[PDB]
């Protein structure tokens, strides 16, 4: 709700 922690913009 605060942040899209599962957002597709993340790298690994």
């Amino acid at each position: 709700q605060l942040i899209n922690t599962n957002g597709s913009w993340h790298v690994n």
Partner: antibody
Amino acid sequence: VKLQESGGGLVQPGRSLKLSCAASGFTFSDSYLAWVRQAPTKGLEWVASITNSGGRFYYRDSVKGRFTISRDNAKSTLYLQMDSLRSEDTATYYCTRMDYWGQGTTVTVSS
Amino acid sequence: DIVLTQTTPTLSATIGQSVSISCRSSQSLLESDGNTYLNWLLQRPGQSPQLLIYSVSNLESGVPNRFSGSGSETDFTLKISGVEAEDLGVYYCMQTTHAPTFGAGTKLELKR
């Protein structure tokens, strides 16, 4: 809930600096965290962010390959390794979980 | 790159006046999970940013009731139902549906 940034200071271009953010008052390993910067007189930019357990992270284009976000869950501390610093990197850096923000640490990159 | 446009860079309000700050997105901010990850922040002079509203309309705890948020998929509004002196500063819209971006800010100044 408390967020306290350190490591900021004055450095010449091309030099390195490591920012740290000491957290307290919450389960650190459960929180997603970010570094948000503000250039003097300007607005906010998302620098880098990291999931609760690491594994997934994000760097804005302008800091890719130069900056390294990391966290120590056992020490409740968030880090931002900043290498090859440019004048463009001059800003106050905030450590944040969105609902809570630190007081900031100022970084000045100048010759 | 998602562009968050806050059309009004400055707003002049009187105490007790109702104000609305708009934020327009370049693309839809509706995420695949059904949530719209648009937040509202206030930054008072010399202070760090402070969260007012998260996910379009949710008021953060400790934040006065006079602040409300609404929005579609691309158009968002922060409403201040009766401005107070402590509400003066710069308001920022921000999204995390896509690679995180902020608006350039809207300065809320006092009309005299």
